[PDB]
């Protein structure tokens, strides 16, 4: 419940022992995550020691422990030194047989990967982007989005796998896919216009994609959408021969009326 940092970093030293208790060790990982979520500052040295203890848990095949490991990796990625040590384990897990682990692994991998090491994993990234499992595909797309900061020139190269993914029936995948595409193509005006023209016909099946695409269209139309969110988005877009009826018609409702009124 309510505990001290030093104690927990201590019991973390049980991870170095061979006959691993998955339940117990996962509990301790949870204590660490909590300490961190609470805002407790861990030093470079103690963080690094705990990180390297956690790696040793990769010997255990317990699923919950594995998942907790992914989390721990993402959370300590910025406070511990030499997190690169997990790269192999994650590329393994991400390419592995079991889908429950695949998306999460991509996310964690990309968190500990820096623009220097990006080249080593590019092939697997392109593979995960086009995977049929939406968990994996979505994870890889958002991952790439994040990676657009540190290294843009490597990720722009991935527009093809991205485009392939943007046809997905899965609404999240489509969302992330078109999102990523824009994030790359933003600032090359031509490719954006083409981008828009493409989905103006044979539009999308994602409400979120719809919303963001409307927002895209707004840079210097149709409110018949069957999702509340898109209709609103469209509306607020339009007002910056008008038809401001649908807003007013939204004005009568639970908690949607804030959005309506807030406009103007």
């Amino acid at each position: 419940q309510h505990l001290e940092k030093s104690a927990v970093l201590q019991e973390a030293r049980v991870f170095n022992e061979t006959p691993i208790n998955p339940r117990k060790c996962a509990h301790i990982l949870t204590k660490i995550l909590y300490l961190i979520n609470q805002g407790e500052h861990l030093g470079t040295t103690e963080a690094t020691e705990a990180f390297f203890a956690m790696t040793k848990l990769f010997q255990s095949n317990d699923p919950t422990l594995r998942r907790m490991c992914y989390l721990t990796i993402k959370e300590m990625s910025c406070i511990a030194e030499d997190v690169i040590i997990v790269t192999s384990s994650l590329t393994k897990d991400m390419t592995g047989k079991e889908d429950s682990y695949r998306g999460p692994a991509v996310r964690a991998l990309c968190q500990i990967t820096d623009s220097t090491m990006l080249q080593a994993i590019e092939r697997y990234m392109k593979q995960a982007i086009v995977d049929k499992v939406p968990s994996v595909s979505s994870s890889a797309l958002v991952s790439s989005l994040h990676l657009l900061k540190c290294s843009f020139d490597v990720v722009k190269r991935w527009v093809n796998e991205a485009q392939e993914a943007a046809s997905s029936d899965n609404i999240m995948v489509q969302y992330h896919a078109l999102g990523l595409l824009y994030h790359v193509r933003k600032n090359d005006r031509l490719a954006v216009s083409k981008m828009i023209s493409k989905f103006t016909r044979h539009g999308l099946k994602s409400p979120f994609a719809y919303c963001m695409m409307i927002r895209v269209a707004s840079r210097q139309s149709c409110l018949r959408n069957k999702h509340e969110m898109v209709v609103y988005e469209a509306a607020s877009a339009i007002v910056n021969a008008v038809s401001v009826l649908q807003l007013f018609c939204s004005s009568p409702k639970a908690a949607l009326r804030y959005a309506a009124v807030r406009t103007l």
Partner: protein, 159 residues
């Protein structure tokens, strides 16, 4: 039994491990990290930590030292330029307090290649004769055939 397997990059450490685990010769990528696997040989379950040998990773082996009962040090017998470097890495590894009593098994590997140095040659170059403080053994291996691998597991289990 807890085993740490290291050596310079491209020595054949992962090839060895997955030959042992899968009876298969896999197509490796450089290991940026570790692989950890459990292997059964004659009633012993060896937990083998294969830790990548390229420089960045080499700097990290010390975290895997603690609790190690035995050390497999893989050498590419065909690479004469890097043998001194191997010698240097291994010598200071021998000075590590967490590795103090661990059994020391050298694999002179890629013995299958025509100009591979012999195990005796390697023994002279690595300075193995000068270890008096713990058990050592050198074994010629070919990880692709599997030659010498189980002779290694055998020696190790007799720590």
């Amino acid at each position: 039994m807890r085993i740490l397997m290291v050596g310079l990059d491209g020595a054949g450490k992962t090839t060895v491990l997955y030959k042992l685990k899968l009876g298969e010769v896999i197509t490796t990528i450089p290991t940026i990290g570790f692989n950890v696997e459990t292997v059964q040989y004659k009633n012993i379950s060896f937990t083998v930590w294969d830790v990548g040998g390229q420089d960045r990773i080499r700097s990290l082996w010390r975290h895997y030292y603690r609790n190690t009962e035995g050390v497999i040090f893989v050498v590419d017998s065909n690479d004469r330029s890097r043998i001194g470097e191997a010698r240097e890495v291994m010598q200071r590894m021998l000075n590590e307090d967490e590795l103090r009593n661990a059994a020391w098994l050298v694999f002179a590997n890629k013995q299958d290649l025509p100009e591979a140095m012999s195990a005796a040659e390697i023994t002279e170059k690595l300075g193995l004769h000068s270890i008096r403080n713990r058990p050592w053994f050198i074994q010629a291996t070919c990880a692709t055939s599997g030659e010498g691998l189980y002779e290694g597991l055998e020696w190790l289990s007799n720590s």
